Write a protein that binds this ligand. Structure first.
Ligand SMILES: Nc1nc2c(c(=O)[nH]1)N[C@@H](/C(S)=C(/S)[C@H](O)COP(=O)(O)OP(=O)(O)OC[C@H]1O[C@@H](n3cnc4c(=O)[nH]c(N)nc43)[C@H](O)[C@@H]1O)C=N2
Ligand code: SF4
Ligand code: SF4
Ligand code: SF4
Ligand code: F3S
Lengths: 509, 217, 1244
């Protein structure tokens, strides 16, 4: 038993309006540099579709994630340690730039400088940001399949259509589409960390954010394959890999990530989850992949349990973090209401960015239909998005937890309608899904009203602990180049000293 | 000629070695962000699997041979091993190297994003490997290992700081002198090129626990 | 030392965890500072976006290294009630990418001028020391003029300087005003709500000098004419937070997630409160993803579905089981109980004009405006003129209200709805039916052109001695819907399955929507409204409003809401969202923008008629008024080209004109004095004799076209300009891609009111000046481009219909390079003009025509029919049967001193709008203290308008929405008319005064104002019509109620007195060109829809690399999989779309979600990025508007008639466009026309 904490995230897909604002703000802040212009730490994909990079969910092709061997031990799908090193001269599974898209820009200046007497109206043609050459045509982009852009036969190659008789969905009346925004999952059992030969990737003890050390990374580019969500992007210019950093500079002081605070649909929740790090391997190596979801919930701890609170304190978790964990919207959605589910738990990484599945308009039928258990509102069985598709995406193919999540959302709607339209108490749908009125009212407070203080409950990462905040507050940021940052030993060849440190030792003890 | 002889084989080796070492340390301490393999694979995957593996498997074969051959079974038996096993490795190395160079110069995305140092260092490695293979027919003229004894004597004098190293080379074929000079030049240029990736061969990975977590620091 | 740290290898190992699966390390983490230092920044500044999206979102602009680096949304809006979600963060993907523009490769940094014009300008100045005379020497020379007009859109821009362009512009302006007239100078700028002062800058300069200010709401087709028709209101709608108070919402032709992005959460969140939602779109749009049910009617046929739903609603909730709530509501708030007079036809009757008090013997005791007061029967069979009709608004006071009272006795009365059960007899009235008409692309249902229905009537003895039959609007309505009432009407339905004029079975055939869905939803929607007293809402957009018959689409939805008592109740009603039309502090901004503080009136013009005329699109008209008439109208009384109807509307004072008269209006006063009469009489005499003519009669004579055009905050030639190729040919004088022949080449019938010439005048504009921060398609075709400050580099204010907050644009840093704000650009032009005009223009006297204005006493113009003075049917009476003729004094040398000061009319006359006025002295007193005052000169002592902030403070201090003091004075003025106290609506906020610096600190909620009809309150959300329903203030219509019956002569004769189904029109743009220029690939005709795009707001951001990267990299068109396969088109193939109007090139997006038969090219991808040459025109490919053309509708030209009277952006012809069809085909040769030798050929 070793308790650690992390700010987890829940995305309510039912409220996602597929606008990509989250993607644009992340890009402007973190990846507008040459080398990562093609990298979208947060990207939104329309489903059905193959996504970015193309077919990233196809692990037989990309080799991401973990496998559980016959002896019960975990091994990265890319190979054990020696197998991985043996692939280092040329990663045979590596995604190529064309699997993302060839980044482009346009010759806007031609509009300004076109010469007098041009025979035709001037225009801005595309140019590659990789070669600087004219591109005859743009053939791909990071969001090429947006809103079912492409023939159904091509979009339906989507890995999540596995085991589904998909022909009926090619009919106009049965059309459906949904949005899947995604970023790094900052996993408890990250495959990237395990697949980096230099050990440059690590999970931060205090807040669970997973980072690629830009000093220590040697550019072995094996981690990109290891990550089954394909959320690590090679910076083709620096020769090192980069990934979503969970906006740690903001999280550290208790602010939401940029994509969370800028989410227009108000679908992202941030909250602490306390977990038992000693149980991670046992949970990720459970024999049946349909048990990974529950095995992960079992690694999450109850923050209001005094046994957990005392252990957390013993293990160094700050008081304000335990307190935040006690009012965590993420804990409520994942553990109490069972509305949030992991993204592809079968990869065995114990992901920490979860999702509430979306509702959808009712399916096509012979007539206008009849009142169901929910009156004029939908019954879960009538929703048009096939539940098996959502289960392939979130629960390793088990439709049971997906149906429970959708049914509970619909039950909340039925209960609230009785209250606000009929002025009556009707808990029939709630009873059917095992929810109490108090739970439905709380769900409603967080999902519907969703006040800012309820969507984001991020505590400080407490940068003062086990460190020296005082000299740092006084001298951080004067980037003159003291050449002493980044090492614990004081000796340095340039005979310099750290600008933000105290070199004259007190002699009075 | 005697002046150039002492310069290249008695002086230059220590200049190259000093630069190699202090340059590596200085770049490690002040240039971590520049310390990377600089993969170009994602920009053009075509032919990389074959080329990079031939090149690296070949050059590591040569490395093992050169390492033990010059720093440590009769010498003439050692020489046969070097000509046959080293020669085979050198052929693999040279084919991979040439394919990599063709790619770096003519594959548009790789050429557009290359640094001049990448073209220079690989060109010198291809030339050095070819010079290496070219010494084989000269070694064949002395199967008793006499030329190898000279080269090994020189190398050993150099690494133990015994003056007069160039004397061991008396009468060795010119081809060997060129190979030796380009080889040392590679060490001189090493810290200012991508070759620093060699220092970082990920040996520790084989025994490392999978999950890494860093404490507050 | 990092190298030495490696030796601490072992020591840095902490405990293992998870049984050896993990290792905790105690190693250095200082490298993490690398991303921390990127996030750190210098400061954040609050700003917003002056783009037409309706978002009005406040953002944090981050400055780092002294440069703008990125933005994230502010989240500090005043919170809404605890039971409502709050607004934060708002935002959208387009807005998140704005920072890209500041230093990007498409930024305009310096003033630019077309090389040929610069060369000639400098040569002219060397021969003419006066710049006016230099301009004259160029423009009066046909070869010189043509040399720079033909260079438009053809490269050659060269860097100039502010001093040079300002002199040329000023010189051209003076020359034009002096030789042709002030109204030959015009400016196009839209939507002032997105950046109030920025719009005001050019409008104020133009208004001072007499130039025409072009409208935009009607031009963009965002104005739903059905709103002025039904309510006498331009547009007033519930705020988005009010959607949260609704328990049943239908999103109809409104793509909420995509086009109302920052507000969409109210829609997704209200579903959790139990609200049911329904999406009605022909394609599987983003909006469907959010709803409970997706209905997919054939595009353009929505009114059919709406009629059938209303039929079910009437049948079940009004007839069979009357709803107490609904019945009382329509009795008190609609014109249903109003009496309509029947006209005798051959064997049957036709519904005529509404009965007026003046029609009865004793005029029902009405001595004031008896002919403008409607009549009904009370429940005791007695005739009465109820309070609230338009006649009670003017000439008297205290009775213009919705109290159910007798307008004569002042006693309480109860109006009777139906005459059934008290009729003197049953009469047969014919109703027009157009459901059997239409093109081959839509299903039709054959019945009869005229449907006879049995109506209960009563015979009345009129005042002129004659007798007449009357029925109520209510009875007429039930018949029009086909509701059997026991009279055994063969054209009424026996059931919903009966294919009759307007049943669920009938609509299923027209729309393809299953009748059981039509019935189930109509019933649920009405049942919800009954149980909640009106909390059913319909969110509607351009999906329905951009069709030629947009009024039928809208009245169908509007009737549904009225029948269920939803308008005026929080949580219910008509929620129309298109552009950002709601500039909240309206009366504070109008005087600033149109210089009403100095001179009245300004010269407003309705743009659709203006471009139809000057870009000569009327010369290619294919639609005839004849084919739009009711089958019961006298065809011979409506002959002529559609433009003839416009000319007639203009001379009758119904619509504005521009240019106005065929002679320089600055010269009329001089001629009037030499003839011994005052200017007004001289003008009226000259008009009668034809010595002075309306310029519209001869648009091509060389003196009646606009010559100088300012374009700012607009991409008219790349976005909104319907008929793009006509604008290029006729306005610009450049090459164009028009494919068809004009009326003359086809030997067609020439107009009867407008001169005709075989070779139309081309290159009309002598100077096109565009202000922008990016080189847009419009800039590419201009003569002079002026670099303007971006929204992150200037101060201004912004409001929207979506929420009640006013907040600012602020300068995060001074404008980059040589850019200047719009306010400073026009200030400098006004300054140069003032000096350049000396000796050319002085204190002048201008004769200005002004149409009869809605919300003025004059709206009571032609009460019973239409009389044309030019036909001798009546006298030419300015302000009643013709436009007002006004005298305006202009002090041209003082233009700048006036521009920069708040004028004396606010103090001398006062301020006001929407029919009320008030004293604003105390506000002017405050303004002298806030802005300081002029020390000397023409405006000595007046408050200053030097900076944009001074201008913003003027707006804030004068408006009732932002100054509690003015709000109470405004409500007091209204109270005089209604006889009811309304001041209680603003008394609790009387001390409130919104200041510019306070809104920079936190956006502020505005104050309840009589300018609007909803309330800004802490217990009820803002809902349009709320004050009409709850304060009993009448709607500004003929009857004072929501008007279901349109009795104006033209409405009756064009078949729209009542809502009726009308099929998409045939534009006839394809059959004449399809197959005429084959490239060997198959061609096919498809419906061309242009809904608004996801990767730009109109064309703004279309060139933005972030949006181009998340989109498809440039102009694309969506096609169904079936149509693309039929045409041999694969996803991303280059395709060409064309018709008689022009051609465009783009790449295909092939998708299952687009239904066969339609194509969607999302709204504006413009003409500057990634477009190859056209195989049709051999020119650069065109844009979506290269395939459209303006076609006006006569019913939108109606004026001088209460609710149908003019107002800037309130009424006028609209730029509808969805009925358009185009030919589509895969391209073969892909030639870029740039000399790069990098062209392609698509095979097969
Ligand atoms: N991102 C973004 N947001 C903006 C704008 C923009 O350019 N981009 N512009 C503003 C402005 S100025 C306007 S006028 C509106 O956005 C227009 O959007 P709206 O959703 O009302 O119209 P639209 O014409 O797009 O049509 C909406 C959808 O209706 C469907 N549709 C199209 N035709 C029909 C029809 O005939 N009947 C019915 N029932 N539906 C039809 C279709 O799904 C379309 O997307 C608004 N915000
Ligand atoms: S958490 Fe921060 S770094 Fe990660 S995707 Fe969101 S914005 Fe980007
Ligand atoms: S901003 Fe929010 S609502 Fe919009 S796509 Fe991103 S996650 Fe979905
Ligand atoms: S463009 Fe409009 S909707 Fe988008 S963020 Fe800016 S103001 Fe809001
Ligand atoms: S494998 Fe490791 S060395 Fe860098 S490129 Fe990936 S983090």
């Amino acid at each position: 038993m070793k308790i650690r904490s992390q700010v987890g995230m829940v995305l309510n897909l039912d409220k996602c309006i597929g606008c990509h604002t989250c993607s644009v703000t992340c890009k402007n802040v973190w990846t507008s540099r040459e080398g990562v212009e093609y990298a979208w730490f947060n990207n939104v994909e329309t489903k059905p579709g193959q996504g970015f990079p193309t077919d990233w969910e196809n692990q037989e092709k990309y080799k991401g994630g973990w496998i559980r061997k016959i002896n019960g031990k975990l091994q990265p799908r890319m190979g054990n340690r020696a197998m991985l090193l043996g692939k280092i001269f040329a990663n045979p599974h590596l995604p190529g730039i064309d699997d993302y898209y060839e980044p482009f820009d346009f010759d806007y200046q031609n509009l300004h400088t076109a010469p007098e007497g041009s025979k035709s109206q001037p225009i801005a043609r595309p140019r590659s940001l990789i070669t600087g050459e004219r591109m005859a045509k743009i053939e791909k982009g990071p969001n090429w399949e947006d809103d079912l852009g492409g023939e159904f036969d091509k979009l339906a190659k989507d890995k999540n259509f596995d085991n589904i008789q998909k022909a009926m969905y090619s009919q106009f009346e049965n059309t459906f589409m949904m949005y899947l925004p995604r970023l790094c999952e900052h996993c408890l059992n990250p495959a990237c960390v395990a697949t980096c030969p230099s050990g440059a990737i690590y999970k931060r003890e205090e807040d669970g954010i997973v980072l690629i050390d830009q000093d220590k990374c040697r550019g072995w580019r094996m981690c990109i394959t290891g990550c089954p969500y394909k959320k690590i992007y090679f910076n083709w210019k620096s020769g090192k890999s980069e990934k979503c950093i969970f906006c740690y500079p903001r999280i550290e002081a208790g602010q939401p990530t940029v994509c969370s605070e800028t989410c227009v649909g108000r679908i992202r929740y941030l909250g602490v989850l306390l977990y038992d790090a000693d149980a991670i391997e046992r949970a990720a190596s459970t024999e049946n992949e349909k048990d990974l979801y529950q095995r992960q919930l079992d690694v999450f701890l109850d923050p209001n349990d005094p046994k957990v609170i005392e252990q957390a304190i013993k293990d160094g978790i700050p008081l304000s973090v335990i307190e935040a964990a006690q009012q965590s919207p993420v804990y409520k959605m994942a553990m109490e209401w069972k509305l949030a589910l992991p993204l592809h738990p079968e990869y065995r990484t114990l992901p920490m960015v979860w999702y509430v599945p979306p509702l959808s308009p009712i399916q096509s039928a012979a007539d206008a239909g009849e009142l169901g258990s929910n009156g004029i509102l939908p019954d879960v069985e009538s929703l048009r998005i096939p539940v098996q598709y959502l289960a392939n995406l979130l629960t390793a193919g088990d439709t049971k937890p997906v149906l429970r999540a959708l049914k509970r959302m619909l039950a909340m709607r039925h209960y609230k309608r009785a209250e606000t339209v009929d002025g009556k108490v009707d808990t029939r749908a709630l009873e059917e899904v095992g929810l109490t009125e108090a739970q439905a009212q709380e769900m409603y407070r967080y999902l519907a009203i969703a006040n800012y203080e309820d969507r984001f409950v991020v505590p400080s990462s407490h940068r003062e602990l086990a460190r020296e905040a005082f000299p740092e507050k006084n001298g951080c940021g004067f980037t003159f180049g003291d050449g002493c940052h980044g090492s614990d030993t004081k000796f340095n060849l340039f005979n310099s000293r750290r600008i933000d440190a105290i070199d004259v030792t007190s002699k009075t003890e | 000629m005697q002046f150039l002889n002492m310069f290249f084989f008695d002086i230059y080796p220590y200049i190259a070695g000093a630069v190699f070492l202090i340059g590596s340390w200085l770049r490690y301490d002040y240039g971590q962000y520049t310390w990377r393999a600089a993969s170009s694979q994602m920009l053009d995957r075509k032919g990389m699997n074959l080329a990079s593996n031939l090149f690296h498997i070949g050059i590591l074969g040569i490395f093992v041979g050169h390492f033990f051959g010059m720093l440590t079974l009769p010498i003439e038996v050692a020489q046969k091993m070097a000509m046959f096993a080293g020669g085979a490795s050198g052929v693999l190395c040279l084919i991979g190297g040439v394919l990599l160079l063709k790619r770096r110069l003519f594959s548009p995305r790789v050429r557009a994003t290359t640094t001049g140092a990448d073209i220079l260092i690989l060109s010198l490695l291809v030339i050095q490997c070819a010079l290496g293979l070219l010494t084989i027919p000269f070694s064949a003229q002395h199967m008793d290992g006499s030329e190898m004894m000279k080269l090994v004597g020189w190398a050993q004098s150099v690494v133990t700081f015994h003056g007069g190293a160039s004397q061991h080379l008396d009468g060795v074929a010119f081809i060997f002198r060129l190979h030796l000079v380009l080889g040392m030049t590679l060490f001189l240029l090493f810290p200012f090129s991508r070759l620093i990736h060699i220092w970082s061969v990920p040996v520790e990975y084989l025994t490392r626990k999978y999950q890494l977590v860093r404490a507050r620091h | 030392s990092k190298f030495l740290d490696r030796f601490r290898y072992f020591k840095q190992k902490g405990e293992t965890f998870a049984d050896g699966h993990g290792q905790l390390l105690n190693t250095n983490r200082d490298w993490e500072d690398g991303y921390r230092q990127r996030w750190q920044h210098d400061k954040i500044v609050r700003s917003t976006h002056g783009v037409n999206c309706t978002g009005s979102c406040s953002w944090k602009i981050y400055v780092k290294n002294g440069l703008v680096t990125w933005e994230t949304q502010q989240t500090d809006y005043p919170r809404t009630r605890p039971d409502l979600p709050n607004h934060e963060p708002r935002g959208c993907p387009r807005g998140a990418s704005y920072s890209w523009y500041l230093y990007s490769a498409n930024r305009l940094k310096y003033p630019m001028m077309r090389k040929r014009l610069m060369k000639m300008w400098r040569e002219a100045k060397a021969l003419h020391s006066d710049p006016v005379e230099a301009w004259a020497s160029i423009i009066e020379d046909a070869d010189k003029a043509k040399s720079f007009k033909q260079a438009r859109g053809r490269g050659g821009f060269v860097r100039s300087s502010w001093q040079e362009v300002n002199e040329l512009i000023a010189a051209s302006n003076v020359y034009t005003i002096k030789n042709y007239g002030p109204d030959r100078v015009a400016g196009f700028s839209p939507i002032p709500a997105m950046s109030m002062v920025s719009y005001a800058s050019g409008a104020r300069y133009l208004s001072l000098i007499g130039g025409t200010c072009l409208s935009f709401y009607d031009w963009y087709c965002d104005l739903p004419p059905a709103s002025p028709q039904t309510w006498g209101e331009q547009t007033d709608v519930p705020e988005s937070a009010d959607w949260y108070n609704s328990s049943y919402i239908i999103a109809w032709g409104s793509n909420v997630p995509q086009t109302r992005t920052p507000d969409a959460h109210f829609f997704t969140e209200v579903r959790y409160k139990g609200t049911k939602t329904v999406a009605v779109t022909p394609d599987y749009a983003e909006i469907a993803k959010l709803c409970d049910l997706w209905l997919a009617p054939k595009q353009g046929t929505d009114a059919a579905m709406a009629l059938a739903m209303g039929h079910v609603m009437l049948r079940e909730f009004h007839l069979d089981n009357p709803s107490q709530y609904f019945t009382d509501y329509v009795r008190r708030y609609t014109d249903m109980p109003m009496l309509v007079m029947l006209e005798e036809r051959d064997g049957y009757y036709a519904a005529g004009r509404m009965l007026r008090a003046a029609d009865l013997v004793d005029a029902l005791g009405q001595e004031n405006n008896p002919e403008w007061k409607t009549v009904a029967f009370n429940t005791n069979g007695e005739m009465v003129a109820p309070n609230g009709s338009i006649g009670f608004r003017w000439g008297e006071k205290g009775k213009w209200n919705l109290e159910q009272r007798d307008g004569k006795t002042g006693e309480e009365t109860e109006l009777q709805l139906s005459l059934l059960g008290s009729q003197d007899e049953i009469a047969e009235v014919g109703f027009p039916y157009f459901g059997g008409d239409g093109t081959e692309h839509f299903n039709k249902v054959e019945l009869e052109n005229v449907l006879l229905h049995k109506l209960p009537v009563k015979r009345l003895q009129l005042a002129d001695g004659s007798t007449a039959l009357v029925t109520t609007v209510y009875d007429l309505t039930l018949a029009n819907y086909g509701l059997e009432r026991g009279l055994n009407d063969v054209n009424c339905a026996t059931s919903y399955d009966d294919v009759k004029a307007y049943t669920p079975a009938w609509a299923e055939q027209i729309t393809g929507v299953s009748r059981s869905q039509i019935i189930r939803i109509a019933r649920e929607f009405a049942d919800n409204a009954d149980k909640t007293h009106g909390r059913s809402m319909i969110i509607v957009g351009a999906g329905l409003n951009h069709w030629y018959h947009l009024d039928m689409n809208y009245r169908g939805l509007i009737n549904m809401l009225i029948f269920c008592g939803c308008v005026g109740q929080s949580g219910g009603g008509w929620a129309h969202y298109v552009g950002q039309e709601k500039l909240r502090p309206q009366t504070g901004w109008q005087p600033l923008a149109f210089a009403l503080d100095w001179q009245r009136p300004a010269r407003h013009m309705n743009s659709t008629s203006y471009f139809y005329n000057h870009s000569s699109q009327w010369r290619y008209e294919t639609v005839t008024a004849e084919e739009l008439l009711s089958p019961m109208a006298d065809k011979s009384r409506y002959t002529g080209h559609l433009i003839d109807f416009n000319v007639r509307a203009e001379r009758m004072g119904w619509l504005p004109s521009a240019p106005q008269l065929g002679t320089n209006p600055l010269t009329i006063a001089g001629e009037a004095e030499k003839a011994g009469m005052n200017p007004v009489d001289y003008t009226v005499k000259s008009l009668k004799e034809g010595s002075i003519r309306f310029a519209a009669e001869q648009p091509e004579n060389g003196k009646n076209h606009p010559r100088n055009l300012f374009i700012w905050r607009s991409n008219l030639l790349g976005s909104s300009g319907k008929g793009h190729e006509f604008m290029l040919k006729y306005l610009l004088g450049t090459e164009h891609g028009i494919q068809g022949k004009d009326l003359g080449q086809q030997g067609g019938v020439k107009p009867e009111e407008v001169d005709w010439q075989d070779n139309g005048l081309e290159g009309k504009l002598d100077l096109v000046v565009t202000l922008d921060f990016r080189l847009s398609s419009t800039c590419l075709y201009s003569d002079i481009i002026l670099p303007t400050a971006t929204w992150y580099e200037k101060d201004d204010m912004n409001t929207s219909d979506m929420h009640p907050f006013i907040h600012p644009l602020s300068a995060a840093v001074d404008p980059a390079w040589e850019a200047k704000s719009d306010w400073e650009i026009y200030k400098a032009i006004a300054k140069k003009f003032s000096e350049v005009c000396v000796g050319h223009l002085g204190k002048e006297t201008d004769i200005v025509t002004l149409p009869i204005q809605h919300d003025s006493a004059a709206e009571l113009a032609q009460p019973l029919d239409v009389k044309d003075w030019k036909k001798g049917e009546c006298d030419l009476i300015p302000g009643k049967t013709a436009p007002h003729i006004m005298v305006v004094e202009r002090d041209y040398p003082a233009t700048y001193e006036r521009f920069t000061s708040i004028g004396p009319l606010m103090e001398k006359i006062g301020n006001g709008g929407k029919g009320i006025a008030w004293n604003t002295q105390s506000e002017m007193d405050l303004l002298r203290k806030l802005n300081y005052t002029k020390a000397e000169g023409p405006a000595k002592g007046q408050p200053m308008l030097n900076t944009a902030i001074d201008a913003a403070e003027m707006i804030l201090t004068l408006a009732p929405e932002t100054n509690g003091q003015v709000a109470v004075k405004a409500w007091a003025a209204l109270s005089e008319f209604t006889g009811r106290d309304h001041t209680h609506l603003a008394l609790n906020k009387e001390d409130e005064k919104i200041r510019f610096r306070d809104i920079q600190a936190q956006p502020r909620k505005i104050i309840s104002s009589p300018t609007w009809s909803g309330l800004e309150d802490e217990h009820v959300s803002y809902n349009a019509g709320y004050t009409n329903v709850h304060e009993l203030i009448p709607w500004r219509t003929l009857s004072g109620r929501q008007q279901l019956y349109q009795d104006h002569q033209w409405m009756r004769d064009f078949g729209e007195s009542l809502l009726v189904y009308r099929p998409p029109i045939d534009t006839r743009s394809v059959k004449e060109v399809i197959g005429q220029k084959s490239n060997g690939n198959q061609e096919k005709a498809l419906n061309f829809l242009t809904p608004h795009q996801k990767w730009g707001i109109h064309s703004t951001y279309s060139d933005n690399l972030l949006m181009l990267t998340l989109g498809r990299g440039g102009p694309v068109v969506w096609l169904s999989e079936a149509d693309a396969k039929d045409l041999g088109i694969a996803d991303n193939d280059w395709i060409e779309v064309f018709n008689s109007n022009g051609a465009l090139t783009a790449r295909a997006v092939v998708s299952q979600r687009v239904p066969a038969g339609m194509t969607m090219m999302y709204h504006a991808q413009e003409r500057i990025v990634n477009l190859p040459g056209s195989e049709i025109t051999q020119q650069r490919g065109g844009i979506h508007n290269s395939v459209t053309r303006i076609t006006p509708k006569p019913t939108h030209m109606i004026g001088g008639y209460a609710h149908l009277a003019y107002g800037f952006n309130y009424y006028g012809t609209v730029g509808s466009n969805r009925d358009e069809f185009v030919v589509v085909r895969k391209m073969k040769n892909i030639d870029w026309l740039d000399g790069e030798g990098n062209d392609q050929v698509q095979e097969s």
